[PDB]
Design a protein around this ligand. Structure first.
Ligand SMILES: Nc1nc2c(CN3C[C@H](CO)[C@@H](O)C3)c[nH]c2c(=O)[nH]1
Ligand SMILES: Nc1nc2c(CN3C[C@H](CO)[C@@H](O)C3)c[nH]c2c(=O)[nH]1
Ligand SMILES: Nc1nc2c(CN3C[C@H](CO)[C@@H](O)C3)c[nH]c2c(=O)[nH]1
Lengths: 283, 288, 288
């Protein structure tokens, strides 16, 4: 899809257009665009200004790349992201990850909204992503499909350790700092392509498969990130409980999802601030 | 290099107008007849027939048992339009071509879609010749990206993220099941989850068993993408499978699924189907 | 804008005719060599070697442990053509390229295909170094639309809806199991279901757990497309995996799948593999 030079071009475009030198990249999903609010000395890029960048066409995805310091830390944030249901191939969806690597970022934080499949979750919960299930990947939709470029990484990268074990413990301990009543949740994110929401039968297959939450993003970004050796941390905001019986009259919808994010804005902001303090310095 | 719908709003609109200007029929219900079920268009009174090839932007049915004709008429008194034959992803069509007619039906003023198919039996309680109402579906091609709504959303048709949890109209299902206990038939009207797989090869024994483990009662290679585009644009949806064979679930059996036996089960069932479609038409509400 | 086969019947013909004139070999059996199994061409007698690059229409092998050569000759006195290295969908190839050779073999007069691969053990009872006979497969890419038979069907090759429930030849299996339970190692022959996933990245723990729950004993990124195309054109098919690693199934292990060790386990088993493959030639019926 893209040449090595295409990524370099975008990398160089940004490097020459800002003095910031991010160490940490954060991708903000549906309703989590607010996480850019506590950035200091921010510099804003529209995705439309950036060579080779796709556009966010989804409500709650602003379409901006924001550099700054978050709680001391040098960040670049994706205020909005791309999804395969919008029609992008996965090499477009994940394009920014390898540009982050080329900017010298060494850690990727992925966030998303997710439907809750585990009965113990409540709307509003933060689930740490311990693992994932890549259903598009099983059948061919893997962002590494095609010729492998050794300058980014190996032909057959492993995913069994994709989610940093250290940052996960560190995030579990330091969670008492939030003073929140609900304990910090941990579990498996299954990616599904969408854009339509799950039937009850589908929700039940996803539960049987062992997933705790379901969304339509995140996995391709993580795969590309581990391919090029970035440390990865992920979490979902549980925005709704996916309908798991034929008696409920509730149905999933996007407005409720954006609204759950708006209500949890401060909780998330605190969580992410604390998290920056837990990322080790480079070298 | 973005994976989108090839058709424009104009395209659907033109097909709608060509159809509206070349027939006086004004259907409320559209019905899609699957493999061996072309026979459902028999009791159409005042039938008028289009070959798919006449109709601008229409795909062709290449599969045996799919006649490739669009038939307007009345069925048990109700104004219908019927797809005698349908389209499948395994023929090589993108899902946007497979489901193309569903948006045409909407623009014609149809407010109800009934989707029919042949399906392999996964639930061991099902006998060849049973009718299984579709209570729900498992969209495997959709899990991994094969979804007819992939790409730019058109708000003229519907929402970016429609829900599918209520796809199969409950009331019609209640109504059809009630009616059928009075028929005092030898076999029960079955109800269950249809799973879509892409095809065109039939399941291995290990695949049949994953499908049973996922909770599907029937398997086929169609229907789901149509149900999704229909719910997207607000049609009431009803679905049924004619169970045409039992999927091989053990290594002993020397039997194999085959397309001939599938079409032969359609012939054998012509009476049950005809009788069932009656109950069905009298279960569909009147416009307003 | 159909997703059809990009090869014409004549394409296959040209490749076959080219091969048939440039060698005096006439294979009855074709064998596809998986990752680290390139060494199976060693026992071939009177070998004639083609590089894939010479053969018209042939895809190129881009993966380590995949030599990229076609090798005719005799194995335990039986006439063979061996693919020394194969093609995978993760390389970027569509399934009509991945499986291109299978139909050429058919045109060459081949009537039996033996597919080999390396695979990750999902069944706890398996050990690195085991040979697992493929009793069956679970085709995940196929469920969602990645089937090499998608698009127009060419009747000159086969049927529009070939059954796969009898894909792995039952007779060859029994016969191989017998011969082996009288000669070889003390470590007995394994049998099970091979699940294809696309790759090229290795499984999460979560994913490993899914594949286990679906009832797979081994996982790989190949094999299934070639089998489907072979069964489609009426080849007898036999398959086996070399378990080259045990897939990580808990969060406590500090082991990780890696391709270098996969190839290492191929080296380790090279002798065991040859001994078994002779026994195998003796189980293949002769043409009438
Ligand atoms: N598949 C799925 N995804 C989500 C999400 C995640 N994204 C939220 C947004 C639509 O609201 C899409 O990009 C999916 C939240 N809830 C759900 C859900 O119930 N199901
Ligand atoms: N997948 C699948 N589909 C069917 C069907 C439904 N269709 C029947 C037709 C081929 O005979 C295809 O279009 C799929 C009947 N039996 C089976 C089955 O055993 N398996
Ligand atoms: N999916 C998968 N495949 C394999 C294989 C088989 N092939 C080995 C090669 C990478 O080493 C790929 O072509 C897949 C061995 N082990 C595994 C595994 O753990 N997982």
């Amino acid at each position: 899809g893209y040449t090595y030079e295409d990524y370099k071009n975008t990398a160089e475009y940004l490097l020459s257009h800002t003095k910031h030198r991010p160490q940490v990249a954060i991708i903000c999903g549906s309703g989590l665009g607010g996480l850019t609010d506590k950035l200091t000395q921010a510099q804003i890029f529209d995705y439309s200004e950036i060579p080779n960048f796709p556009r966010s066409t989804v409500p709650g995805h602003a379409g901006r790349l924001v550099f700054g310091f978050l709680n001391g830390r040098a960040c670049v944030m994706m205020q909005g992201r791309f999804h395969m249901y919008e029609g992008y191939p996965l090499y477009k969806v994940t394009f920014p990850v390898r540009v982050f690597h080329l900017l010298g970022v060494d850690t990727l934080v992925v966030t998303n909204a997710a439907g809750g499949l585990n009965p113990k979750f409540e709307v509003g919960d933060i689930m740490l992503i311990r693992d994932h299930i890549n259903l598009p990947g099983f059948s061919g939709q893997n962002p590494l499909r095609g010729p492998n470029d050794e300058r980014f990484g190996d032909r057959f990268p492993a995913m069994s350790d994709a989610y940093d074990r250290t940052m996960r413990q560190r995030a579990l301990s330091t969670y008492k700092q939030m003073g929140e009543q609900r304990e910090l949740q941990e579990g498996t994110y299954v990616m599904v392509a969408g854009p339509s929401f799950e039937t009850v039968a589908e929700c039940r297959v996803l539960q049987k498969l062992g997933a705790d939450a379901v969304g339509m993003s995140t996995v391709p970004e993580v795969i590309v990130a581990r391919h090029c050796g970035l440390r990865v941390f992920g979490f979902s905001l549980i925005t709704n409980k996916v309908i798991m019986d034929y008696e409920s009259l509730e149905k999933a919808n996007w407005e409720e999802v954006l609204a759950a994010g708006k209500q949890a804005a401060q909780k998330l902001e605190q969580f992410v601030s604390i998290l920056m303090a837990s990322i080790p310095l480079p070298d």
